[model samples]
Every structure is written in C-alpha cells, then in structure tokens.
Target: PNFSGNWKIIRSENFEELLKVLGVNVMLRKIAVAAASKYAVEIKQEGDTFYIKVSTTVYTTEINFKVGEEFEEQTVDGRPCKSLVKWESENKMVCEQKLLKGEGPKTSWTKELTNDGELIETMTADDVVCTQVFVRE
Candidate 1:
C-alpha cells in the first residue's frame, strides 16, 4: 500500500554527522538538531505521484514527484539536489540524490513504515548515517 499520511518526528540521532556531511554550519547544525524533532511531515499519494510536505520549527519544504523520475529538490538548509525515490520492498523505499552544490556529491536514504505505522528514515552521506523516526499524527 502507499505510505500516505501525516507524521511527526519523535526520535532523531546522529544528526550532527548528517549536517556536517552536508556542509551545514555550526550555528545551523545545532538548531537543526533540535528542530528536527519539531517537524510535521505530511505525505499523500495518487497513482504514481507522491506529495510530501514537511514543516519544521525553522524551515518548510514540499516535494511532488513520481516514483521513478528524478526531480530537483531543495533541502531545509537550502542545499540543492536531484532525487529519485524507489520502492524496494513491502515497507521500504529508498531515495537516491545527487548533490548540486559545494563539492556536489551523492547521497541516498531509506524510508520504512512499520506495521504499527511508525516511520523510520535513515539518511546516509559518505560514511555518516543519521536516523529519524516518526509516528502517525
């Protein structure tokens, strides 16, 4: 089934490494760590297209993309990337991104929605890993 719903982040860890790998500054990194948990993520799907919107204490972003198509994306910190998300398993979706700024690199992430409606997002850049968990709102 499509993973469509409104979710709120409740658990986040190793985000400092996540920010550092993305070129976020010291001031923004500290604030992003705390604000991460304050995010409300809303997702909706229709056919092959998906709508994702996230509003944090300090930033807001939304994405409209199809499962197999790459689209431009801008992070909360204002970094730009091109991404494509694909479903790899029953409850798992993986997203690939190519950075378009700084050294302009690559990153990928996995999103898993459990049977109990918990959402887990694992983001990896280079060798650093960050995890954020959310529950339906």
Candidate 2:
C-alpha cells in the first residue's frame, strides 16, 4: 500500500465515457482514450503527503496531497478543482474533487492495490467509471 514506485498501465475500461462526463470535448476525449494504454504513474510518499505523477504520450501531470486536506488541482484538459484525498484502508486510497466555482459537479476516484500486486485506478464522473490496471515498472 506504500505506492511509492513507478508503474505502467496494462489495460483500461470506459475511460472515454468518464472523460465525456467530465465535460471533455469529443476530439480531446478521443485523443485521451487512444493514449490510455500508454499511461504511467510514479508515486513518492513522504510522511503523510504523497506526490503522484501521471505520464502519457500527450502530457505529464503531477499532484501532491496530504490525507484529509483540500488542495487545488488542475486536470490535464485544464479543468480546475478543489480536491481532497483520503485513505479508505491500508490498500485503498480515495479522492473527491469539488468543482472550482461550480465548473461542474463533484467527482471522485479510488486507487487500490490488489492481492496479486496489480494497481487499479478507478475514476468516476456523473456515474461513469473508468478503471485502469497497472503493474510495477
């Protein structure tokens, strides 16, 4: 549950729908979904704070968060929001994002490590869920 390492994506499901619900335009959503399989993540933890970096062929973005604290975060497509991250359990992490100035509705996501050592990231927006599986790099 440390999540302090690099990982590469193995597969993803419903990613475009999640993006669509997040209000991403059709052209960009297509580009994003097309690059889903190449996404990689790198995580570094220091005490209660974690630095998570996501990289793909189109762009790389990073966010730092401490459990239970709200922080500003910008999505890759340029949407801004206030985000709070929390631990659901030792192996599960959850994040909820509130739209900045009502840009949109609240969206949430979770990251959980499976018993077989696969890292699963699940994102939700307007009831749409996108799940991606990753493995250590």
Best by lDDT: 2
For 1-137, candidate 1 gives per-residue lDDT tens digits of 65799999989989888888878998889988878879788989787688989788777778889988999986434578888989898778888887786654357778888888899988887788888899988
Residue pairs in collision within model 2: none
TM-score of 1: 0.89
lDDT of each: 0.82, 0.84
lDDT of 2 by residue, 1-137 (tens): 57888999999999988888778899998988888879999989786798999988978889889988999996444678888888898888899887786566457878888888899999887677789999998
lDDT of 1: 0.82
User: What TM-score does each of the candidates earn?
Assistant: 0.89, 0.91
TM-score for candidate 2: 0.91
Name the lDDT value of residue 13 in candidate 2.
95
What is candidate 2's local distance difference test score?
Answer: 0.84
